[PDB]
Amino acid sequence: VLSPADKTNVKAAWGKVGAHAGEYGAEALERMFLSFPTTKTYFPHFDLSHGSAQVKGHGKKVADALTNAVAHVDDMPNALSALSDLHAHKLRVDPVNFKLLSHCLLVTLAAHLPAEFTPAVHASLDKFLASVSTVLTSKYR
Amino acid sequence: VLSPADKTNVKAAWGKVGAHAGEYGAEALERMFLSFPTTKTYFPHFDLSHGSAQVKGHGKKVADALTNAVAHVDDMPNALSALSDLHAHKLRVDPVNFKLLSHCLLVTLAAHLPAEFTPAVHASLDKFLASVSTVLTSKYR
Amino acid sequence: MHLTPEEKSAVTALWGKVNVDEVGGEALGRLLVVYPATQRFFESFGDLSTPDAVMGNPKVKAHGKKVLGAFSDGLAHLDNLKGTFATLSELHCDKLHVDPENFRLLGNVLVCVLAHHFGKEFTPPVQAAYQKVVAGVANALAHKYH
Amino acid sequence: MHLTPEEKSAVTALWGKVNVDEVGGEALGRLLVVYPATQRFFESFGDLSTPDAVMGNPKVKAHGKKVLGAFSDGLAHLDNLKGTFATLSELHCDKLHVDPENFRLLGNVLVCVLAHHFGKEFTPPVQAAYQKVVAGVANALAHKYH
Ligand code: HEM
Ligand code: HEM
Ligand code: HEM
Ligand code: HEM
């Protein structure tokens, strides 16, 4: 469960992301496909080459959904109900992959936000991405 | 989330387990220690030889807690609160291990309850152990 | 895949008693019932909406038989799982796009099915040897992913 | 360790620039803060109630240096991680009782720490090579568990 300080930490870090959300989302995807190639099995219809426009657009989408989760941190299951439904009933991504994307988003943030990525904020982001993942996989069965 | 049918299935299956719980608990443990040796790192103070009394005694306690969760299936997080605190603050067992014990309990039930371990019951039991594991692991950080 | 001779004997002994066709159908059907997400790969199989619809589906049964047939053949080559499953690995990756985590789920369901069928005879030491084999087969099928 | 020549070269050059004292202390501290459960092995280090207490704790800092030192030496034995870490694997299992899953957690924290320090230079391809090394190290440390 996210504590008050966690929420505060997440809102502040994500705040600094600002207009780079989309770029970071795309970067995290790229890091994931290269570091963890089994994740590519979910995207056979995508051009996965560096700088491809499908990865870019998808990067924006993920990033925006995350922004919405941060804005709705107290009410995630509701704010993300449709995405939760989509992942459970259509996409059907194995849960292990959410941990791989989460780690890659952390590495991306660590690389772009040096001053902001303190040990306490790192802790809070990791918990936040974990709750987001839990919400997106809650209706699987 | 458990569905009405899952609940019915779990009460039925556990009802056939009856006064064998303790014994099945100890068997699940031995299965776990032999198949997944890394799990032994959490029990260095135990005699882990076949038939060990510490293993029998601990099997009983695990089984009693599962019996209690079945009895309070509509209020598990509260019925297991004390156990959740113990695991989070003292024992601090990594969550992957819960999946390993759950699998071994399923194998144990399959080996002893051939007529009841139908596909539908197997599914409900797997969901049931996953909910129990989530509760025991929910206060870790 | 470090199997001891006595583990290898335990694995082979029991396997000689297995009806692969029937066990194959059960393991695949249970995978699809217990982990419904795995149904994403079988939309062409028809009705998979309830447990009886899955378990009795002739296409599930036939696919189960094919899967387990290849698995048996793997048990005849425990010293070279990787070479044995190389072309299947490539196929599952480049053509079928199957996330290898699914091979691990199937392995564990197969282990419950063996326990269900054999009861007592699937002792803790025998399960331990099978856990190593299912992990080795899952690793071999994942080895050509890129 | 299926490492590519360009991958081996990527790991080596970046590492030539790491201040092991700082990175070690930072990795171990972050591990204890991000995954509080890992504190179970470090009760004697003192106060770890807060992030500031952990990061400043001199024993945490010093244990971090020791851990990364051993890691550093492993990077010169990439063709033989198992043999290099064998004794340490035995000690982590037989004397310290450390669940190997913690090795994977430290690996990932380490990667986050490298990115945090090197920013731009820690590109997607460089991370991919480090993920392989950190998994290789974890696997070798877990190899002698029984
Ligand atoms: C933080 C976790 C994640 C979030 C917030 C997220 C969010 C989203 C969003 C916003 C969409 C687009 C839905 C639309 O078109 O309106 C989507 C689709 C998709 N996601 Fe997830 N996702 C996450 C993790 C994952 C992971 C781990 C995978 C698998 C590795 C995955 C695979 C997919 C796929 C294949 C699509 C459809 C892509 C397409 O065909 O365009 N996602 N997700
Ligand atoms: C189905 C999941 C589990 C349940 C229901 C469960 C339940 C319990 C219970 C009832 C106790 C006794 C606490 C007391 O004395 O009041 C206990 C203790 C303990 N459990 Fe858990 N447990 C589960 C999973 C695990 C797993 C996965 C591990 C790690 C492999 C583990 C490790 C321990 C340890 C080391 C103790 C202390 C044993 C001792 O020193 O006597 N448990 N658990
Ligand atoms: C023991 C592990 C497995 C083995 C040995 C195995 C083996 C096989 C074999 C021999 C085929 C037929 C190849 C061909 O058509 O040329 C096949 C096809 C297939 N397999 Fe696997 N399989 C395994 C696990 C799985 C898993 C767990 C899944 C997904 C959950 C899966 C998905 C598929 C699919 C979707 C096909 C194509 C079916 C079709 O004809 O439309 N397999 N496999
Ligand atoms: C990169 C992976 C790791 C490496 C290379 C490593 C290396 C080392 C080394 C070289 C020692 C000194 C042993 C001696 O004095 O002979 C040590 C001790 C120790 N390690 Fe590890 N370690 C790793 C990960 C971990 C993690 C993840 C844990 C638990 C979270 C852990 C727990 C310990 C403990 C409790 C000691 C004994 C410290 C003491 O004397 O109080 N290690 N480690």
Short mmCIF file of C-alpha atoms in Angstrom, two decimals, chain A residues 33 37-45 88 90-97 140-141, chain C residues 34-41 43 92-93 97-102 105 142 145-146:
data_model
loop_
_atom_site.label_atom_id
_atom_site.label_comp_id
_atom_site.label_asym_id
_atom_site.label_seq_id
_atom_site.Cartn_x
_atom_site.Cartn_y
_atom_site.Cartn_z
CA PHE A 33 13.09 -5.05 -25.79
CA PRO A 37 13.92 -10.02 -25.64
CA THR A 38 11.14 -12.35 -24.54
CA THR A 39 9.03 -9.20 -24.17
CA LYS A 40 9.10 -8.78 -27.96
CA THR A 41 6.70 -11.75 -28.27
CA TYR A 42 3.85 -9.39 -27.37
CA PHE A 43 4.62 -7.02 -30.23
CA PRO A 44 5.04 -9.15 -33.40
CA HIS A 45 3.04 -6.54 -35.39
CA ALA A 88 -6.92 -9.15 -18.70
CA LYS A 90 -7.51 -9.16 -24.67
CA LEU A 91 -3.74 -8.65 -24.41
CA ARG A 92 -3.28 -11.28 -21.72
CA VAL A 93 0.33 -10.41 -20.91
CA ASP A 94 1.99 -12.70 -18.43
CA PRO A 95 2.50 -10.85 -15.13
CA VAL A 96 6.26 -11.39 -15.03
CA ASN A 97 6.61 -8.87 -17.82
CA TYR A 140 -6.82 -12.08 -15.12
CA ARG A 141 -8.80 -14.98 -13.62
CA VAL C 34 -6.17 -22.82 -14.50
CA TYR C 35 -4.32 -20.00 -16.39
CA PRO C 36 -6.99 -18.65 -18.78
CA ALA C 37 -4.52 -16.08 -20.13
CA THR C 38 -2.87 -18.90 -22.06
CA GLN C 39 -5.98 -19.12 -24.19
CA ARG C 40 -4.67 -16.12 -26.25
CA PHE C 41 -2.78 -18.64 -28.43
CA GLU C 43 -8.54 -18.77 -30.51
CA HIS C 92 7.82 -20.89 -30.86
CA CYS C 93 9.74 -17.61 -30.98
CA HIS C 97 5.39 -15.70 -30.58
CA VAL C 98 4.97 -17.60 -27.33
CA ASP C 99 6.28 -15.96 -24.19
CA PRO C 100 8.56 -18.68 -22.68
CA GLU C 101 7.09 -18.13 -19.22
CA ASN C 102 4.24 -20.29 -20.51
CA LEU C 105 3.51 -22.89 -16.25
CA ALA C 142 13.53 -20.74 -24.62
CA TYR C 145 14.64 -16.75 -28.46
CA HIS C 146 16.13 -13.44 -29.72
#
